Symmetry: C3
């Protein structure tokens, strides 16, 4: 059979007849070439016509069926890694079939089958104006009946290019990788670019999943039209999962108004070490009761740390909501080490600039620590705040940040009336001066709430801003109790108003407050120790006060310290070297229970 | 020789006769197929019987000898990476021989030979009830005489499964990867699961080693029995080494009582960016003089940062100890950005809940910075503390954390009597309210020590807790000197006790203290400026005090501020508009040297 | 043609005649062995003589031309990854030609051609005493006319060894990887060792580039001679780029004086999670107007976070400078979570020890947040400071750090006279005690500036140091305005000087200041309420003061609180139970406008 031998060698079984032993090692396995080649697999092993002849990829070739066949086949052997080869662009031009069809899926991923994308995957214009999810991990059109996707990793130096196609309708959805009910899945190194999509990657489904991660990926120009309803680049919807060391960039005007880089929706999730530019928002951090089926109705242990961002709206948005039968709770959050700015834009030209936003009764948000962050907004941006507190809050703690923007705490008057509890603004927060002189008519801490309880505001200025109406103001509609409100005197000598309580709330039994004020006093005419009394009777709530002014006089001195009287006068004991009625104006620190 | 040609091609030298040139490039090397296949190596190249026929792996096959032969052979050529193939489970069923036998080793690692684990490595029931170290980098049963393991990396998407086997005796030890005297070794991406082990990975030996790292690994259910004496998932025992972006999970009740995620035992080590659930402890940070031979007797530059944890005992434990000839020192530690909770459990049902624990004379621990962390414990967990300070401390500094648990500083009375120096609790630490109303009979800062020197405690409440006995208490057995202790007045108006010095320690020459108190005063009957004096004589130590109460009276006012007299009365000058002896009760801020 | 068949099989086209189908799958592509082998490429495919025979690498073989041919060829097919094989050392012994020749380049990198370095690349002694850049991404000797290098990644477990060769002249330059105008390029996992170089890696060119990263690399002993002018291991000169999780080590005495680990020179750059030992400096953070052509004249969003360092000079150095036509600005910087020490060395034996250094009119540096860091210097190191403020500063904010060194704020007298604005030193900075008793003749905050405005210094001691001349001192040459300067009383009772204003600057209209002082007072002889007046007349600027001393007297008490008089006396109302002139010395807290 020498003719048969040559034909076998030239046949597809040929490599299975050529023997091999590793490095001529007589202790190694006696193999055939085919066995060694079978240790790897690429798209080339499936990218063939029905007669087995390889097809070159290109804009006129739908690679979908070939990629699916490769995934299917490797799955059947218990898994492996399929290379998508460098130096080629592989186009996708049709929808997939079966369980992914309900999900507008293109490729169905399978457990233990990894994709090493080194070349480029592009969408063909078949998808213009249509929905799609490029890779889908569900195995059923009903996700509630889907099996899991496990141990599926997408990685490499390659690219997923969405073709630039706009959305056809705002009700459509588009995704890159919908991992599904995903356990130990990841995407690493991939660039996702040029699209109009809802998400690039979604991890999990309604809390179902674990240990899913997006690392060292790039996301570039993924919103490009006015049709696109909403965008969150990575959507984390399973626990013990997160995003780290990624890069996010947008250039579209639309992105400034609708795009968020990350949403965290389940417990023990994180967003670290990433850089964002051109987005509306940094991260949504939420527990929606609608997605509580997999991991519970609490989102807790949520970390947003060490990120760099230029955004046009709000850095971190906190929220929760409820269903008719399920209640969401958000607690145990840390936001730390982030360096964030509002990009150059006109005032009011994008959603309100904020480092933290509490968005819209329902909210159950508490135990949030905001520490060691920097925030800046250019001086023209009136709509910029350390916190826009627009809905109920049950706790948030700010320590050792540096906030350089128009407001510290803001809510718009006559909009929402939030109930606030456990808002803590430590004195170690540094208030920048970029907006000094821009604050005519404005309150630095504008406390436009229904009520404030168990809260601390310790205002410390670091430069003058005499333009502002006040440092902190409480409208008469805001109840205030069991709270501590202080204004440090530095840089406040020339301010007409420091703290303003429009309903005289500072008189509350459990309100602890100190702020500077100018007070007119008159003494009796007695030589020697002599009392000085305030002309006004607005000080019934004052427990003590003390001088912030020098005494220009030789012949007498006002009291250093004052207490009050039943009629609301302040009273203190000064000294008349020579007698006579004295009249002075003095800057005092007014104190109540502090 | 045409018969010889066909036989050669079918022989194991066949591939060495089929020529190849890369992509038909006439400028490329004229090679044989075998040369290209020899650029890679897998377990298949060694997993053969004595006649060279490949053996399929499975539960009835001991893969150990084959894996060892592959490692040995690649080592002999100066290194490489051996793939452990996907889609198969490779069982290990015997101990190795030679230098690793003293270490109960299964596989001996070798320098420059990396393992790319894509499939699964499982332990066979041969190992039930026995000790083992699955991969061992020592080359000698005496580690002091061992050569080094250098440049050995274990990585991939695969799994090491310990088979679920319990320990046979609590004196046994079990490990996944014992790298040995390890320099530039790492484990990346691997899942370690289903066991009862002492460690999953140990880096270094008695300080010997460098540049060893565990990254993006998972560790799941590695304690499962009551026999297991102790567990630390990763044990870092060489410098310039650490753990980052890993996931640790336990489900066993035993793990809650004995398992720690990481121990750091040498200088310039770190534990970052990781998530822990179900463990007793987060990290031990220590310098044991017994392990000082490789890198010295100082552990310094130790970082525990940006981790997420649910634990049942103590997050970070600090310690050192000594040998008859060597003294260990621990200094220069940072703990920051961590978000930690005590999981749901009954009070006292696990080791005492703590964010920092100083464990058991000997201790030389100092220069520790604890900053920007969040800690929570459910309201029922009586045994929860920001710090359990149970042994001598020479310094620890707490700045800008948020601690929401039962105690801030605790030590059990009549147990240890620690000597405390340089404990600094900055005012920027926020004290949560979850345990409000639960503190009957308890002191928030319970200073159960032999002595306290050069320490600062600045207590700032953020809500009321009238259940507590005091904010801070010093028993008479605790010496207090050269210290600053302050209680801010906010939320304290209704407290009977704020700071308690049971030995009147606040009278010390170099004690700086301020806290609120209620004081009864009586005046002389003089009209005009008139003195008011305290009825009690307990105020000889007071340097000044000032009013925290309003004055309900028209006809007189008490002094705003007071000093003292030799007999221990307070005294101040008030004002009698009309004469008469006055008697009042007032809330004062008592101050000593502040 | 059976003779022809055997000859074809033995020829370099042989593999192109042996058929293959993946795993015998009749649905797979009918391929040839050569097609599968062509899916990978290594240096072996090009490392051949002119007759196609492979050449073994070694010290007598210049591998350069072969590596270049491989890169060239893969480039021609649109990219790929070339393996540099493990188990071999590949020597480079000549310069490259063409566009890289102007750059003293050895290898020209090309777009989309990645290098997987598993073996070792060594420099041959041809390069002793000469300049070189081992890998160069420019395609033109004039970088301004160069095309870009895109999508070029160098990775693996291998090594680049510079051969130990010293520089021949201090004007020479040497680099490992000069990526050029580099977009999406990276180096991961590589060890760079044994050299005398200017840099190991430079990312970008004059701001041109994006998305370039150095991750998990090691840099060991890269300065070794007195000839070497300057060294920065990684130089980041394109935006959206950075360094993470690397290790840097030097052992040379020269490195202590000239080597920096990282320079960041463009916006949105970072240096995270790394460990440094033996270097002079940690990171330079700068915007040099000379490099503003690619990315603008602002460096903003600059992060230095979570690093471990032992250095001999300055951790972070901030700067900017200008050109005749372009002005550089540095703003929006965060330095956080770092644990840094000055290594063991004699005082003044290396560049001045500092955590932050502001280096040398020109500087426009502002919005810098320094938070949550630890810094230590041994007690002998006189030249150690939290900040050496040696040039103009427009803002820097310090919150919640722990600084344990000789000075907090320093500048040498009669050197530079910096103009300082917006320097904020929050009270939450903890000042360590290691240098207690070492500060004879020294001011802890030594304010040797031309002027200080809009600045806050809140000094809080945590132990005594009676050796120091003062806590803070302003020479009369330093203007001080619109500033807040406070010294907390704790541990200061025994200090002769607390805050010193040598030009009486504390009297400024907008200066807010409080510090302790000892004051002698005398009373009138009146029984009853009686005034006490200071003997000295140095207190015209004081707004209030209060007692920090107890009253040892029964028969009288001095005032608790004081104001002042026009003549500069303090005055207060005390109480004479029995008449008589009183004379006392008291410790007061002096306050101005606070
Ligand atoms: Na209301
Ligand atoms: Na004692
Ligand atoms: Na001057």
């Amino acid at each position: 059979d020498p003719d048969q031998f040559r034909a076998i060698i030239e046949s597809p079984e040929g490599a299975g007849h050529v023997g091999y032993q590793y490095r001529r090692n007589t202790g190694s396995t006696m193999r055939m070439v085919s066995d060694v080649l079978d240790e790897r697999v690429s798209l080339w092993d499936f990218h063939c016509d029905p007669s087995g002849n390889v097809i070159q990829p290109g804009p006129n070739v739908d690679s979908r069926q070939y990629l699916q066949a490769a995934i299917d086949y490797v799955s059947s052997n218990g898994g492996g890694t399929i290379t998508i080869p460098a130096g080629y662009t592989w186009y996708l031009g049709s929808y997939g079939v079966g369980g992914i069809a309900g999900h507008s899926g293109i490729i169905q991923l399978r457990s233990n089958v990894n994709l090493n994308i080194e070349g480029r995957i592009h969408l063909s214009p078949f998808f213009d104006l249509k929905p799609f999810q490029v890779f889908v991990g569900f195995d059923n059109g009903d996700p509630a009946s889907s099996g899991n996707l496990e141990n599926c990793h997408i990685y490499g130096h390659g690219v997923v290019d969405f073709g630039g196609y706009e959305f056809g309708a705002s009700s459509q959805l588009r995704n890159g990788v919908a991992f599904g009910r995903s356990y130990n899945c990841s995407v690493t190194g991939i660039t996702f670019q040029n699209g109009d999509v809802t998400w690039a990657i979604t991890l999990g489904w309604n809390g179902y999943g674990s240990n899913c991660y997006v690392r060292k990926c790039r996301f570039i120009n993924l919103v490009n039209s006015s049709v696109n309803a909403d965008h969150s680049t990575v959507y984390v919807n399973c626990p013990y999962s997160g995003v780290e060391s990624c890069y996010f960039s947008m250039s579209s005007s639309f992105a400034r108004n609708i795009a968020c880089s990350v949403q965290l929706h389940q417990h023990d999730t994180f967003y670290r070490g990433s850089t964002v530019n051109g987005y509306c928002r940094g991260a949504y951090v939420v527990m929606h009761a609608a997605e509580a089926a997999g991991a519970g109705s609490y989102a807790y242990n949520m970390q947003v740390e060490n990120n760099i961002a230029v955004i046009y709206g709000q850095f971190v948005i906190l929220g929760s909501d409820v269903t008719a039968t399920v209640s969401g709770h958000l607690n145990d959050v840390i936001v730390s080490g982030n360096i964030v700015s509002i990009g150059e834009r006109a005032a009011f030209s994008a959603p309100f600039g904020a480092f933290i936003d509490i968005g819209p009764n329902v909210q159950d948000i508490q135990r949030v620590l905001v520490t060691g962050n920097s925030f800046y907004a250019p001086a023209n941006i009136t709509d910029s705040a350390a916190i826009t507190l627009r809905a109920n809050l049950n706790g948030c703690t700010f320590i050792a940040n540096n906030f350089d923007c128009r407001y510290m705490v803001y809510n718009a008057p006559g909009t929402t009336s939030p109930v606030v509890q456990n808002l803590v603004w430590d004195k170690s927060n540094v208030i920048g001066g970029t907006h000094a002189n821009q604050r005519a008519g404005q309150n630095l801490f504008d406390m436009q709430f229904a009520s404030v309880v168990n809260s601390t505001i310790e205002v410390q200025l670091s430069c003058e801003d005499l333009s502002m109406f006040s440092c902190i103001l409480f409208p008469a509609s805001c109840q205030l109790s069991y709270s501590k409100i202080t204004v440090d005197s530095a840089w406040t000598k020339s301010m007409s108003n420091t703290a303003v309580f429009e309903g005289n709330q500072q008189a509350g039994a459990n309100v602890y407050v100190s702020y500077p004020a100018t007070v007119n006093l008159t003494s009796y005419n007695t030589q020697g120790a002599v009392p000085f009394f305030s002309t006004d009777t607005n000080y019934a709530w004052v427990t003590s006060a003390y001088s912030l002014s020098i005494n220009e006089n030789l012949d007498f001195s006002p009291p250093a310290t004052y207490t009050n009287k039943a009629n609301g006068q302040l009273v203190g004991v000064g000294y008349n070297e020579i007698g006579g009625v004295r009249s002075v104006s003095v800057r005092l620190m007014l104190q109540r229970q502090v």
